[PDB]
Amino acid sequence: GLVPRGSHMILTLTLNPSVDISYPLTALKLDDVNRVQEVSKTAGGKGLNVTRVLAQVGEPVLASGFIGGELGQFIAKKLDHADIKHAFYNIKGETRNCIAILHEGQQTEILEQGPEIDNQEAAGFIKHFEQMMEKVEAVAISGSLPKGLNQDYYAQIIERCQNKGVPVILDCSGATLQTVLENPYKPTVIKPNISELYQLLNQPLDESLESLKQAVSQPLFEGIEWIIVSLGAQGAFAKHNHTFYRVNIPTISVLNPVGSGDSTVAGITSAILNHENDHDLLKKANTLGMLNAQEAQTGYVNLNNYDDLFNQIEVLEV
Amino acid sequence: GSHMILTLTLNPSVDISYPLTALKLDDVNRVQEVSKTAGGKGLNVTRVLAQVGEPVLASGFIGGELGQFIAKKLDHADIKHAFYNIKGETRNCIAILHEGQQTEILEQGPEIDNQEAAGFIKHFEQMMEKVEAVAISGSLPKGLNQDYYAQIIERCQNKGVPVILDCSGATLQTVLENPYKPTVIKPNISELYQLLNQPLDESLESLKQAVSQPLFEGIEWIIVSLGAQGAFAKHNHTFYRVNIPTISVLNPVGSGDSTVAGITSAILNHENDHDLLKKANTLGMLNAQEAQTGYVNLNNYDDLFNQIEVLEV
């Protein structure tokens, strides 16, 4: 077996990674000292969840984005331990922490804004990204932009992809997604959940098929090949060019559905890399999402259970 | 030559401070203004010594990427260090400042194994010719034998290097029970009585009885700090009361560590009893006037030093 030298590889982007600290406490005593023994500290970020699931699936993958300081080094180390390749751009600022306190049935979180990217670093990353284009065949982009970047930064990145014929799978929300949709350079896939789809449309959430069809058909979403709307336990609703799919999925035992969309995005990206057909793509995406929801870990799948779930999924033209 | 202080922080931390308007439970709290510092009582002592212009070298255990954050912060302050690296990772600690409250999460931190413990002792010995005083602050990290400070102080005594010690509880108890004695201890009043399992009593007669117990045998200086009320001390057979003025206070945390920096400076320079006590309290006071922890403005030193009264009692 030779190490490959071509472009058969997925690039993931995590522009605002975090060192996530999880504090499980018997009780959170306010205005007091809380002593902890079993802290978990992890490499955090939506794009990193996508990366980890791709690595589990066995797809060739490279992680990039911005890292800074010792916390950036911590992230690199976590990826090294997992044998995941990375080529982050180094910044003068410091990678952020995020805190989760798990106490008394509650999850209390403190989320840091993170570093500011300066103009030289913003420009340097674009050049770094350009050079990576000849070695990759798909780009997955997850999460919002860190402070200091122009509003158009994802639009600029997608332009670089479009210029080299590289498909972009995009998973962002709110104004971040809105700015992309209005720009001429298009992602190949977007993956909102139904909540993200409607708040983007500034209209109320409607679970009906007819309303969904109209929603994804609006001129906001023109030029986008795949619109895959994930529906948690109800599966997915999707639009490919001019075709509508409804993706029905079996009921399973859920532990933590967080990162299931990231797991879906990994499935979509794996399927795009391999030029899979519509049914196989939608089934892989949902199988990975479901498998993650069955796990206590975030962005994690047990593939021993893959085939069992995959074969239960119904995809139909609606 | 060896005109230099060594500080020990066996248990450092990367301290994160989050000021929030409200701490919203079971919800997301967004912060933009975060302060992350190289934490530990011994590092407070170190910063204040550096500020006063004393030659100082910081040691202790560090590990992993958080260990390097600590080294880098000292480098930026131009503070010298000679830590010993461990397999484990230096810990974080969290303080959340919300609605007049201070909610803290303190990580237990890394376990120091047998190899590293023994390795550190050798490294420590190698530093005894380079220094003329040692300041030891804080509790032991996980995994160290209860006698570890006893072992350290033994090496100092072997080379006639005086030790200023600031720890509490069973840690201080263990040192006091061993033959190798520190030259100074600096409990606050609360710590003194907690150690003795006695009720807190601020009277001169009670303090004189407390510090003269057999447990404190063979300690040259027992300096009991009293916050805004100043200090009470025993030097050999002499008792001292240190009275101080009422000043504008912002944050007194780390004022004991500032006092310890003052004491150690005074010991290094062989200052007299009055000058040692006045310097110790001046630095404690200067710290209390600052929002930052373990920070002093020396432009205000003389004015406060000049107001301190030291009485033999």
Ligand SMILES: Nc1ncnc2c1ncn2[C@@H]1O[C@H](COP(=O)(O)OP(=O)(O)NP(=O)(O)O)[C@@H](O)[C@H]1O
């Ligand atoms: N409770 C559940 N039961 C079964 N399958 C689920 C469940 N939740 C999610 N899934 C699967 O995972 C897919 C994506 O989940 P979903 O919760 O819609 O993503 P998301 O909200 O974007 N989560 P995140 O990755 O944290 O952003 C779904 O379409 C399902 O196939």
Ligand SMILES: Nc1ncnc2c1ncn2[C@@H]1O[C@H](COP(=O)(O)OP(=O)(O)NP(=O)(O)O)[C@@H](O)[C@H]1O
């Ligand atoms: N509110 C205050 N006003 C004036 N001076 C103070 C005040 N608090 C502390 N000081 C000075 O600082 C010295 C030591 O403070 P103290 O609070 O006794 O230390 P501590 O309890 O060991 N604090 P820490 O360093 O955080 O452990 C006192 O003896 C005073 O000289």
Ligand SMILES: [Mg+2]
């Ligand atoms: Mg999502």
Ligand SMILES: [Mg+2]
């Ligand atoms: Mg103290």
